[PDB]
Amino acid sequence: TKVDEYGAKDYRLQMPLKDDHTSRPLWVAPDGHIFLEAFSPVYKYAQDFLVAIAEPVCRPTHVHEYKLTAYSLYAAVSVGLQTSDITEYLRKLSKTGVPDGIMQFIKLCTVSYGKVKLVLKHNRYFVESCHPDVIQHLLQDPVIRECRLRQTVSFEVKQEMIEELQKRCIHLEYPLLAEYDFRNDSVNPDINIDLKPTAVLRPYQEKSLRKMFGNGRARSGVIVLPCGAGKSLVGVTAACTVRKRCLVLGNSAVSVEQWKAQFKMWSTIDDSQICRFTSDAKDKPIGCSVAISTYSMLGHTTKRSWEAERVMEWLKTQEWGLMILDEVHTIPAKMFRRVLTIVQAHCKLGLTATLVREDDKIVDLNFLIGPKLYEANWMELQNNGYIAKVQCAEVWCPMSPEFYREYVAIKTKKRILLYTMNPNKFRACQFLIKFHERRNDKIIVFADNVFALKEYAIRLNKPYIYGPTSQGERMQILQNFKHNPKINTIFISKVGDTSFDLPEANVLIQISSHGGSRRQEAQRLGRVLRAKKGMVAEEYNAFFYSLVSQDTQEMAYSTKRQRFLVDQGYSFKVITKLAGMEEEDLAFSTKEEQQQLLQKVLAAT
């Protein structure tokens, strides 16, 4: 609240300093921000505690940055950490005390939890509460009465209005409890699903699962883990532990196929007990319990087949022990979020690898599913070797003079097709691909503009893939990329980042970018995180290049796009010039070639 002569807020008169400050490695700002030391001997203990009570926002190598909020404190109380159980240790760890504001915030957040519990039974959602005064003073607003369908006091609530009531309670200071007591539940018989000994659970996976299962009752929340880290394995383990009917929701056909494959590989459950509620292929969804479908499958708003109506009505009628939702970052979308209310589930676990978006709808996920349970430390995984180390880089390509002339001259938005296609970046990517090709490194080129992708691919006579590409040709190209030594590069369009199971690649070049999309950046980066059989963290075998054009809007998009990665800790090194480019022969070495490309770009319209 107090501002120094500079931008920073002043806290000299706010909180004191502990005498044994050097012993205490923890800081506590009044706003809730906490700065932990990664060099302290008790760093691991501090990390566990701060991860339990707070969500990371920046975890560089030296000083980690956490911030706590109501949802994080609720998650701590869910794993059973009382207000004293957290605040006492926070004061002990803190080297400068705990401001009264944070003290009262912690007390209020912890006490305002568990008073209101939401439990669904016999397809009816009852708002139970041991304390009656909470309901007595909670029925002030008319929205509660109109929402409601027309000790331990409970009342049934309308299915459709659950989301609205949930978001209302969040700001009403009475969060709802979505814990599932699968251990004590006889209404829905347990499913015959077991985890085979073959599956191996990594320490971070076990920690995330423990945080989800803080007690005997499973907690509904979001666990953010890298795509290469085995989030599919974690989800399968969660379903197996729940031992009740599970409905996994993908985002595309490849996602549903991979989820079925993961279920069979890691769970002893029989093949016949798994169904694919997909229009292209139906495996008798009503016959068995464990189901895999997608958000468009359930939330579809327009006409439905008669068979799909029967399946949908069966799904609505039945109650699900677990509702796994992969790629939760798309949930707050209108149609996708309608699925949450369409289907009934005790705990709706959420898995993803890039929980970031521009529109401030990510906060809605906290109430749509639950608080962010776990968020794996990418740097720690890199050190442990679970994830391949990446030498993140941004190759700056100077724009050609004529291209810049038209780019600046026109105030329209042909620049997206212009600066994405310039001779300098073309030569840069050509040289980079040549260097890695002679180095036997697998290349996965990326480009949002299909026009630029096709032009680059034809000029380099490479197998470019994109949306309307036939499925058979897609599979043939991927198989050749994985097996044929003669080919070691594939030029994938935006479809690549959506969802796929692609072979591990040693480099990932990105000539163009869709825009300032942290989601797309992280999604594409996750491709090369696939750990090799015997690599090492320090070898930096994996590389990521995000080619950008200097003095262009692409620079703004790149800088705005690398925020999530730098927050994780990756250091994007800038490369002004590439050694050996002048000696190596490359296309567009003469003005005429650039002129023809420019004429084609102008004629693109």
Binding site: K44, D48, E206, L209
Partner: peptide, 18 residues
């Protein structure tokens, strides 16, 4: 037959005392 996760949170910091 329950799993280790159902037991409870590890509470890794509880070991340290001052």
């Amino acid at each position: 037959r329950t799993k280790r996760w159902e037991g409870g949170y590890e509470r890794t910091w509880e070991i340290l005392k001052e």
